[PDB]
């Protein structure tokens, strides 16, 4: 199963969270092209993005939104509540699958080992081209700084996209 | 087996093959095989595996329809939770297809619920086949109805890979 | 590769996809042509393997359209055969679809030349998936030519088969 590609960066004062849109299941047969896995919470300050299953992040996204509702938008302490709530469950403990969030002036991953990390460089990705989005971010962010956030979170997937077979260019980026 | 669903023009419908059974009517009626009528027909659903799977499914679909005031999406996300949570039905491969008057949704042991780009889905073996021979009656020949959508993508997969029943929303 | 050939209305027509993966999943060419037109634009042919292959086999059969001077048929069955003498082209298991203005044909490296049912043929990983747009749209789109229903056939299998892409060369006769 690979449920879309999703890109995020924090760059020059500004955040954006990109995806593309192509679900496949296996290796050969495309279900969708124009998906949308990013989401926006808490009155659309914080993105969250989860390539995994449409049931595990239904429940993870209730859960982050509950607790940034505890926290008051605190990213921070929202997310390690979170995630050790994850570690907690032992139907969502299995799951290897990463989740990124981000506002204003954070980007965080949250790990169902209750791990949770600030990138280096303030960017990260996710889901089957998500390696291969986050090899050009780090490129773009370190040799064309003069693109902005959003370009970048775009023309990263871009590359995703040309490289992998899992990743199409139907790419959507939200912005803060 | 093969199963096809698509709304088209404020209409909906589902097919596959054809089977002639008895109900609490105690009258024969041909319906299609693993495609039922659920949520007093305001739903239509389909599965491609197992009949004894089919009905599991079905039944769980139905109650979750009912949690959630008949709300797809919501049932289908809960099923899917339920789908991947159970000992032997996450073992299962095949998707079962739900859809009302609004919205088609295809549900997966692996947890996932797709929306379809163009109200447009097909499951079973030869469900590929009916999946490219419905986009391209879905772009070329928008003036075919739901139903006859139905009928001439099975048609088209059975002359690749007669007895086709197309159930009316 | 994915190649889709049609015939419709005295009109022919081949479409092939341009995605070129080497056996991973990683693309490195999207723009790839295998399908070209020889014996001076009088036929079309498409080969579903490798690109390197595809010439020598489109220089082949190009050699034995002149050698015959335009007729497909013997044309492809002396290629058939020359195809599985030659030491290097024999194990190629892919096949290679060739069309002139009356008949399709699929030449293989084990010496067999077909002649497919109807008047669509279609090769390669997403083969079936153009075959069954393209029967739809003869069966329910007829107004359409044969250069568009190759297209529009290969379209289908692009956004549904991983391994072709919607880098769509289309040559008609």
Same mark, same amino acid.
Request: hydrophobic share 35%; no cysteine; net charge positive.
């Given at each position: 199963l690979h449920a879309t590609t999703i890109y995020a960066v924090r760059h020059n004062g500004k955040a954006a969270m990109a995806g593309d849109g192509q679900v496949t299941l296996?290796?050969?047969?495309?279900? !969708?092209?124009?998906?949308? !896995?990013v989401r926006r919470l808490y009155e659309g300050k914080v993105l969250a993005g989860f390539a995994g299953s449409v049931a595990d992040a239904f429940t993870l996204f209730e859960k982050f939104e509950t607790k940034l509702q505890q926290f008051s938008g605190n990213l921070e302490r929202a997310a390690v509540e979170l995630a050790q709530e994850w570690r907690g469950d032992k139907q969502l403990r299995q799951l290897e699958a990463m989740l990124i969030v981000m506002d204003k002036d954070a980007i965080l991953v949250v790990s169902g080992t209750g791990e949770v990390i600030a990138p280096d460089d303030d960017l990260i990705a996710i889901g089957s081209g998500g390696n291969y989005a986050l090899s050009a971010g780090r490129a773009l962010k370190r040799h064309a700084s003069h693109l902005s956030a959003e370009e970048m979170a775009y023309e990263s997937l871009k590359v995703a996209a040309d490289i992998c077979v899992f990743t199409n260019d139907n790419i959507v980026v939200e912005t803060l």
């Open positions: 296996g290796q050969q047969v495309i279900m !969708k092209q124009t998906a949308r !896995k």
